[PDB]
Amino acid sequence: VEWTDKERSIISDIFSHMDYDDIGPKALSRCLIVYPWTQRHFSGFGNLYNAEAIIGNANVAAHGIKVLHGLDRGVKNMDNIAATYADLSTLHSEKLHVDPDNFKLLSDCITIVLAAKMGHAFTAETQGAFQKFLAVVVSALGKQYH
């Protein structure tokens, strides 16, 4: 990845203004509804056979905030993302057994939730930069799978 100054500015601006306790729960809830195989890693969170059950589920919500703040270390390390996420990649692989394709699916849900919050301000260029950042983190999160 090579970042333009404009991409760095957009990413910085989105994360300085992000309401994590709003976007986190919404993005993870929307992922468990739209892509329900992602519920594989959440079974004991309670009964998630329902969209209301899921969106109500305070375990889901707390996990959505934790995973969204997992993005902060890449914002602070934009030229060293692969290495920064190496330990988290190894964890998801060897401890949590998370299919890394699910990282792309949650990314798309984070994008869609962010777009609904930002509205007309989520321009094509803003979407490009933001999806570029998530794509570099998703790759990093999948790197240590062996």
Binding site: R30, I33, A51, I112, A124, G128
Partner: protein, 142 residues
Amino acid sequence: SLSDKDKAAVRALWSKIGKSADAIGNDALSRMIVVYPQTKTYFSHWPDVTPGSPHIKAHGKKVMGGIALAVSKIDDLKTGLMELSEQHAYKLRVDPANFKILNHCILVVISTMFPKEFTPEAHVSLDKFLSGVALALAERYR
């Protein structure tokens, strides 16, 4: 396949947002060509393959016209979109992988314009429907 639940959800959402199909189309196709510039290969005939251009704007109306037709033909997308399938297979040779990319851009546009209407339940049904549209457009390819 689309359940009765899914069809009701798509019809209900389109009832609410259909009025804005032209703007949705301009925005979605502009996003496609900016964020996924490789899609520009199919528009090489046009001098203005830039977001919100006359050509992209007018094409956006047509593409979303195609989506409106799909809603109306939601009980049988294959038959409904047969002519469009033929055009994309035989005339344009658009790789069906790119339907996935436009579909994601359509979802992003509807989320930016209709945040209240685009609930997670509206989204799962619309995503199932747009996948069904992509597969019906692939019907005449091979």
